[PDB]
Amino acid sequence: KIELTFMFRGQPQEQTAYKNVVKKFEEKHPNVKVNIVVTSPDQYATKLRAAIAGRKIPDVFYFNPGELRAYVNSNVLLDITKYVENSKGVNLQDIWEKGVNKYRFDGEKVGQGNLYGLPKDLGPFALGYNKTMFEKAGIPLPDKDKPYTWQEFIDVCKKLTKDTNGDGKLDQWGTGLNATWTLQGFVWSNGADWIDESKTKVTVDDPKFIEALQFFADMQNKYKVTPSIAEAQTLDTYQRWLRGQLGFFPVGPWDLAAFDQQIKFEYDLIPWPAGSTGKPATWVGSLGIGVSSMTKHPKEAVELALYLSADPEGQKALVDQRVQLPNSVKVAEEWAKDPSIKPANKQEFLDIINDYGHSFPTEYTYNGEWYDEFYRNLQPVLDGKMSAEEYVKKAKPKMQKLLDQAIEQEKQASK
Ligand SMILES: OC[C@@H]1O[C@@H](OC[C@@H]2O[C@@H](OC[C@@H]3O[C@@H](OC[C@@H]4O[C@@H](OC[C@@H]5O[C@@H](O)[C@H](O)[C@H]5O)[C@H](O)[C@H]4O)[C@H](O)[C@H]3O)[C@H](O)[C@H]2O)[C@H](O)[C@H]1O
Numbered sequence: 217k218i219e220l221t222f223m224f225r226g227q228p229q230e231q232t233a234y235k236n237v238v239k240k241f242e243e244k245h246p247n248v249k250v251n252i253v254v255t256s257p258d259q260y261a262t263k264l265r266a267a268i269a270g271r272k273i274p275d276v277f278y279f280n281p282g283e284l285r286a287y288v289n290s291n292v293l294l295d296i297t298k299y300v301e302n303s304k305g306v307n308l309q310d311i312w313e314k315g316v317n318k319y320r321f322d323g324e325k326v327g328q329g330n331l332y333g334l335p336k337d338l339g340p341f342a343l344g345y346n347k348t349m350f351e352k353a354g355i356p357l358p359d360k361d362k363p364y365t366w367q368e369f370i371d372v373c374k375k376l377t378k379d380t381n382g383d384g385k386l387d388q389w390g391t392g393l394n395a396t397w398t399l400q401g402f403v404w405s406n407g408a409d410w411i412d413e414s415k416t417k418v419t420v421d422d423p424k425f426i427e428a429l430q431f432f433a434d435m436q437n438k439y440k441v442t443p444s445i446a447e448a449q450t451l452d453t454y455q456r457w458l459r460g461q462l463g464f465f466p467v468g469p470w471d472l473a474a475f476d477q478q479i480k481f482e483y484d485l486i487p488w489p490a491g492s493t494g495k496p497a498t499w500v501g502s503l504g505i506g507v508s509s510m511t512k513h514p515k516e517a518v519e520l521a522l523y524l525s526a527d528p529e530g531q532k533a534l535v536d537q538r539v540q541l542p543n544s545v546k547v548a549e550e551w552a553k554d555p556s557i558k559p560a561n562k563q564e565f566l567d568i569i570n571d572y573g574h575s576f577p578t579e580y581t582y583n584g585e586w587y588d589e590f591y592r593n594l595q596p597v598l599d600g601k602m603s604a605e606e607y608v609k610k611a612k613p614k615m616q617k618l619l620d621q622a623i624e625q626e627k628q629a630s631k
């Protein structure tokens with residue numbers, strides 16, 4: 217009788233996994249049929265934005281935590297608090313508090329108050345290294361607790377950069393980090409950030425930010441511990457990591473399934489190299505599972521969100537399928553201690569969540585346009601055509617204008 221539209225995004229292993237778990241949901245609730253709208257991670261924001269613009273909102277949908285307040289003011293997200301409290305068995309007090317709290321809003325500040333969504337996951341972005349490669353090269357393994365310094369990291373990367381098949385051409389490299397997803401840690405580790413403590417002032421022209429940005433680009437251009445610009449163009453560094461060509465690459469729990477399938481070398485997790493603070497940094501992502509404020513079936517919609525987010529059986533199926541770590545803290549802890557589930561240092565994911573992971577800057581602002589502008593024109597720095605110093609001076613006023621507008625519009629839209 218009842219039909220739900222569930223809209224989400226995922227890499228192909230993620231799509232497959234959630235589609236399976238939705239079938240499990242439907243077997244459990246035979247009167248609820250779930251129509252799926254799924255996209256690649258890159259297509260999602262535009263599609264969700266179109267749906268919201270036309271006020272044709274999916275019953276259940278993935279959404280960015282940074283848009284919680286905007287969604288609440290625009291009446292996009294149903295207040296699901298009472299459905300979640302009335303639900304049989306579930307106790308989201310078991311769920312990561314940092315995850316649950318991202319989708320609470322008391323009318324004024326995020327983090328407390330009524331539920332406008334449930335955490336899909338927490339997504340600590342760990343650093344992986346190719347253990348097979350280290351061992352074939354006789355290089356001492358990275359320490360599982362003590363971060364490399366930046367200097368040490370380049371030193372090891374250089375050792376790993378070599379022509380291994382002896383044809384005269386480099387065919388193996390220290391790393392090849394994607395600035396979109398790996399610049400944060402270097403910036404943060406160096407005691408910088410995109411914006412100030414108040415989250416209202418762009419601070420990318422901070423010397424510490426610049427040093428981190430230049431350091432990042434220099435991996436490719438100056439230190440040359442990555443494939444060349446042309447080589448990464450031919451085959452991107454994620455793919456080259458999969459094929460065993462790179463010493464170092466990040467690992468999210470959502471990668472685990474794809475890696476199970478494609479990676480044949482032994483790899484493990486370590487802290488990110490630490491800058492001037494000496495403490496490692498990286499991000500802990502999250503997605504919200506929200507229900508349309510206008511859904512015709514709030515109870516069943518929340519039931520699907522709950523099943524994906526907090527239900528032991530639903531959660532178990534997702535963890536089994538290697539697309540996330542458990543949302544239940546105690547389950548995650550026993551998960552991490554299980555030696556038969558690789559990577560050996562799974563615990564690093566948890567350590568990121570508890571000790572040294574941060575939020576994306578955009579989680580603190582009303583929208584993320586100011587931040588998207590930073591990355592929109594970053595590539596010339598990344599390719600050594602423009603210095604980090606010259607770009608951030610150019611970008612800052614553009615970013616700041618956009619931040620100001622997001623601040624103004626949060627004033628307006630919440631009146
Ligand atoms: O140029 C070649 C590129 O390489 C290939 O991508 C490799 C993938 O990219 C990296 O992962 C980045 C990102 O993560 C995946 O989504 C996971 C979800 O995001 C997490 O939360 C993240 C953020 O937090 C919130 O502020 C906001 O909502 C999110 O933006 C959440 O915990 C997870 O559920 C997504 O697929 C990917 O883009 C990894 O290295 C690897 O997976 C591509 O072919 C190409 O882009």
Ligand SMILES: [Ca+2]
Nearest residue numbers: 379383385387
């Ligand atoms: Ca070679």
